[model samples]
Target: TLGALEFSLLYDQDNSNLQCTIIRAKGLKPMDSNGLADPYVKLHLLPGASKSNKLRTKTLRNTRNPVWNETLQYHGITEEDMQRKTLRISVCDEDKFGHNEFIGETRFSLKKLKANQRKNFNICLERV
Candidate 1:
């Protein structure tokens, strides 16, 4: 199920780095008085083919309308290498206390940046 969610992505002028900003999309209430997966979210980045589920990093943890400004640095990353790499954004929610457990996911490719040679770009996330 989809809930309130919105995010944005911004890349640096050098095209070697990017930033992601995620925020709460809506407001929710408690369920059964035991808390629900209503207002919690976590973000992760991983290899497109790896099933290890090992999180590369944690952006936001257990908060409502959380705002995260994260910069992703690509060291020695060339235009050719960008085509071979893929990135996935995993969002989850805590089942027990509405903390975070894997609610949604989104994937993107670096090749797009290579195609235009524009180098840098920003992704703006809007609520659906």
Candidate 2:
């Protein structure tokens, strides 16, 4: 099954910050043989340099569905920055036995967004 995430983006004109809100995940893949999935959201921009750009969401103990209701911000974005990088949003499961279990992910180009406007997106996670 394909997992889909609902999210929103707003580019600020004054501060040049890109704001992203992770809304919810629907029909996510499963993990955790003991049951309930330990799902979380992770984001990174291509050519990412630091923790400020690479971020995570609160881990949720749910299967298939999780409501993030969370917002994240990236500072100092310029028109050139938006034109150059790719935004990758990945969702994974926390693995108690090993490394984080990757579930699904999606990638986007920022130029599609309008400055100072909020745009909603629903993207399906791609298998890796």
CA lDDT scores, all candidates in order:
0.43, 0.85
* Candidate 1 Cα outliers beyond 4 Å, as residue runs: 10-15, 23-65, 72-74, 94-100, 114-128
**Relative to the unseen true structure, what is the C-alpha lDDT of residue 45 in candidate 2, on a scale of 0 to 100?**
91
What ranges in model 2 sit over 4 Å off? 31-36
lDDT of 1 by residue, 39-72 (tens): 3334333343343322333444445444434433
C-alpha lDDT of candidate 1 relative to the true structure = 0.43
Judging by lDDT against the true structure, name the best candidate. Answer: 2
Give the Å error, residue 8, model 1: 3.6
Q: What is the lDDT of residue 70 in candidate 1?
A: 46
